[model samples]
Target: HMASATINLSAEKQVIRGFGGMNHPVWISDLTPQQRDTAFGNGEGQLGFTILRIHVDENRNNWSKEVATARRAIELGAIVSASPWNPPSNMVETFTRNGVPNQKRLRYDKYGDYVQHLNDFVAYMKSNGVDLYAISVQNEPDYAHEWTWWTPQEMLRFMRDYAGQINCRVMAPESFQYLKNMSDPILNDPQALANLDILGAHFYGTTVNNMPYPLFEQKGAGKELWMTEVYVPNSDSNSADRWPEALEVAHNMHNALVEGNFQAYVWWYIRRSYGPMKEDGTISKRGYMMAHYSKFVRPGYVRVDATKNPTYNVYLSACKNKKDNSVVAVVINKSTEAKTINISVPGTSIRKWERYVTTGSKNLRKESDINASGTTFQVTLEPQSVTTFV
Candidate 1:
């Protein structure tokens, strides 16, 4: 038997924004109405996603296409944000950089027009009954092999000068790898940093050590940080259903929330063979892994200190909901065999707990109610599973 040190509710951490994924209806198909319910609904077999990222398509004709899904998501109580891959073709020009050929960039001469373009997007969503939570200045400006690129200085100039003109929160420089070099300019420049609302990042290949940014901690006061996009392990076929492999989604999210101190987690695609859901709208294993957090941690909940790694291959994170003063603890077990660990939240006791788990053989399986009513209790974790106690 193993025991965790203790869970300290007094030692609170980041205020969780929420969990969700991107919905690129332009390239891929939009989620069906039923799928939307499964994605954003909090009922049984739902993903409980609270954020939705939609594309700010460069073409005006395609603009109306985004309205339907964003509107539905907003009605379902999800925050909607837009990221652009390029400005309208006229506002973009071909350029050369690092001797790379055919690099595209927003024309420096059209900077004012670009802001107008983004503002128009905010208006379009609003007029159609969807209010955007935030809009990114650029999606992965640091790695835009196929999209428009922006020099750090160019991004700085826009945010410092024109970002505030937008009607909603302005997220800038969506770093593809959360690279410091890509965001250092914004953090260092007081004016540029002031206009920035969310420090959105994509974790394509971000290393464990590179996840946390001390500079954001030092200079990012009054700003939100979010892991805006990722699909863990690989984009390989059938990877989302692979046992233990799908567990990496939970592990990655654990580090992003606990180590990176990000307030939100968003996946690359909400419904793909390699994503949280399948093409037929079924929740995949990876979706269940994410549900372990999204369904319980919830919006406005604050993460509280807990013995994160009480034993090998066992990961844990806890949060406190101030509204009801309830606590949610999610446990992830990746070892080849089952493991048991005792945990306690000092200065608190719960009358009952509903334990929900997802294992190789189960998907968000609810065990018979656990009748624990003390400060201490022990639970056994099945191998390669994620369990949520609330």
Candidate 2:
């Protein structure tokens, strides 16, 4: 069957910051220089990741653990952000939640101090030549069993009063399930909203309906929305190479841009047995799933209008580099059978597009060109596969 879609360059959406994953040297080891190049470099045997997320250790002494990988990642053309699981011990107090004792949290009077600690990390990273692009107020504040617990009011108060003092861009209240209640207060309050540079969320169990954030759309005119942490399908460390299961990651990326309208898609870890990079530092099947986008959809590219879901069992998203007039369209076929699609750019014509595919057997395998003349061209997408027309 022949399905049709349009990539309208005139109708622009969000400017993509890029796709990437996290690195926690405290919990897990840092990516070695060779691994760093493979993760960020746009060449053979690489994942082509463009964003990097790091952890902010509670112990200031542990701060040095983050520099090597972060500095090298920045040099390899990736943007870095930081998240804190807990504040320093001196500033935290034990509070009860629903009669449960020993609920650790930041002291009410220590709001300013906490912000300063975040600033200290930013400046420390800067001094070490990392230059963080943004820093989070807290990581998963609502779901902090081992970390700090924050009510919306506490977050609002901190943002209203202290977030502006930070040295770099401020991200806040990273919701664990992308729960909007965690962010509603920030968007509702003018003072808090004024200081929030990015509204970050995690997709632990986020679905089609849970992804749409109408409130942020209404109030976040100058702010950005980022899917900062996620691992699709399952978390089992050995499940990274599962065939069709990995394809769902590609599906999730498409919906993230089309339905959720997020500017960035960041994974939980760059290298884990169950992540994009495996224990041997090799790109896994799931890693290639991410490469279909991160490899071609470079930073500063704007997502233009396209038939998001052109037909049943198929998904599509498109972006363009206005500076070079180069366009990229990622198409995913979730069926058990092959499907063909006719893609067009109404007024634009392309001589050819370098096509790449990743299926159960192929790992970002480069295929023939998608030749185009006037209004359309055809490409066959394999069953349970993702293909990038770059």
Candidate 3:
């Protein structure tokens, strides 16, 4: 049985979905109505989430507590983008409240009200001192779940009009299962891309490297690619501890930033039983990955040009912190074999710099013992390890 499967070699790599953050389902259950405000108000260990994607209920029924949960995430410095799986049961023409398909999907007759509802939700978050960054047209358009469904033309028309009404950014068609089939119909189809602001996709059956390119690839430098949600599935059975997980982030981040040239990366479901953090909100290796990027990179940190030496399974992403003149380079080694990673800094006289690494002796506990002396240094990248040197 262990010898049953073979790794596809000639097969071109697919992109694993790229963004990093959690779906705040934690706020949905357990937390009382009042705890919602208190949880986010005190910055309940957001760890490193600059952007958050949320699901909002259109007519409220069957939507559950996700709305309040999302709102809490926003109050805590996450740039929020709320999406919808379904409108109100009353507004829908077909489909059951539990998200089972019925005879037909709800009609677009109430499209105006739906767009207005999204706008109102954004306004509500802002009213509560939460900065709502964007809103998507629907959770997914290709597959009709128990949620609302829209055909290509239906979504095109609604989004064109919807984009005009909402002052904030409009994300469209959180396409299900398929990327090209679902997204191309809307993005490549001139009418739909016109209303689009950010091109987002949930990566299921494929990886971010699936196309090895995204919808935003090579498009006039404004279009953004968001790998909205993902998890290192339990089935991989590879190493999930901090050291090996570094390889995961490094591998994905390399493809997303270097290969795909995506500006923004999002992760799904920040907190879980297997999360990088504990129940008390202690940091996990994955949590540290987000922190390394978010804390140093910050929100406005523009990714500059940097190249990783592919002679080994090493990746490098460099950015200059605007607040300080210090340049930051994050390096990850995805090799099961140890590699002597050398970070070369040019055009800057860095008399000294700091280095931080996450390695595991047993579990996700990060045992980083390093100090920097000059612009360049070498470290033995542990087997299945992630290292961040700044």
Candidate 4:
């Protein structure tokens, strides 16, 4: 038995950032060209992933390889982008090129140069056929990286002038510590918010529930908030199988989508055997929480209103696909005991609905097999599962 239970997927209507994770240059270089293309699912009749968050490494050899992989991802019809936590060794004020965490010699006086270095990288990727959709500076600027250092002001100055150097959208301040207080300095600063196209955030010491309410209330309308990186707790990742990890991933997805109001969701280090999906590319039960959206709600899909029921541990997100005349609903169970949920579909007349259950060890296999009913249908959720209904 795992330590935690009651995983629910019903989150608020938020953009489901379709793809997340990193491809280290060394590892990417090791893959065959065909393997590289197929990893993003280039084959016909294959389930393909549209968006990728490619982490740009700071090492010289690794940096070159990262660019090469970026080009490959673009060739596969996926939008490509780069992000950096540290610049080159000579350019950074703290740590070495290898990321060894140093406190001395932090916060360089010339923030302008730092911005240009990243800008040049954006230019380089664009020239190579990978037109990056976004570029995030400082992977976790709040936590001092072994490679680079930037106080909030120093980072802001870099982001402010970043507009002149690169035409691509600038994403800033990937703060690892998710506490709102650490990021408020940059979010509150008008200059930083104005130049940046997206507000980049990470989940480490906190969850999406910690996001500043007033800030979301004020900026949610205009800004693109992204949950850029996360993982199962270090202890959990050591398990031999994927079931335990699935519950954790499901829970994190709920928090990121419902509470955070983030338009895009990104998972760090995708290829790990302990990741959301399986290492052999099979769908892990926990992955259904993701597939409910990734599999059905294709990219460029808008999230409609999903009401919350306080008494039950259920979450519902609905999307209507006009091209196919299909309506998709993603429901998550965040409770220990399985409870039946009631639904109210107002505008559209629905004739059929399908249910896909993702529970501990259930993965993608259909259970209870409830087809769409006349008005409402009862979904028998397993104890602590992430279930999706369509």
RMSD of each: 1.3, 1.2, 7.5, 5.3
| lDDT score, candidate 2, position 284 | 90
List model 3 lDDT by residue over 198-314, tens digit each: 776665555654635444453424445665655553323322344554446546655556555555666554444444443444555565555555554555555566654534566
Between prediction 2 and prediction 4, the one with superior TM-score is 2
Candidate 2 pairs with clashing backbones: none
Candidate 2 — which residues are off by over 4 angstroms? Answer: none
- Quote the lDDT for 11 in model 3: 28
lDDT of 4 by residue, 1-390 (tens): 212212122322555445545565454333345544544562432224555677666654555566665676667656655677666666645445346545423346545566666667776776766778888777776676343555676665665655436567877677886655545655676766677777777878675547544675675456677777776554255342455445666566556655665666666654455544455554344334455556666665556555533346666556556555456766767678876665555444565566666666555555554543554444556666666666
TM-score of each: 0.97, 0.98, 0.75, 0.81
Q: Could you tell me how far off, in angstroms, the CA of residue 211 lies in candidate 2 after the best superposition?
A: 1.4
- lDDT of every predicted structure (CA atoms): 0.89, 0.90, 0.55, 0.59
Put the candidates in TM-score order, highest first: 2, 1, 4, 3
* Best first by lDDT, ranked: 2, 1, 4, 3
How does residue 40 of candidate 1 score in lDDT? 89
**Tens digit per residue, CA lDDT, model 2, 1-390:** 578888898999888998999999889788898999999898899988889999999999999999999988899899999999999999999988988889988999888898889989999999999999899999999998889999888889988989999999999889998998889999999999999999999998898899998898899898988999999988887888999899888999998898898889999989998899998999998899899989988888999989988888899999989987778999999999888888888777566889889888888888988778676877788888899998
Q: List the residue pairs that clash in candidate 1.
A: none
The Cα RMSD in angstroms, rounded to one decimal, for candidate 1 relative to the true structure is: 1.3
**Candidate 2 global lDDT:** 0.90
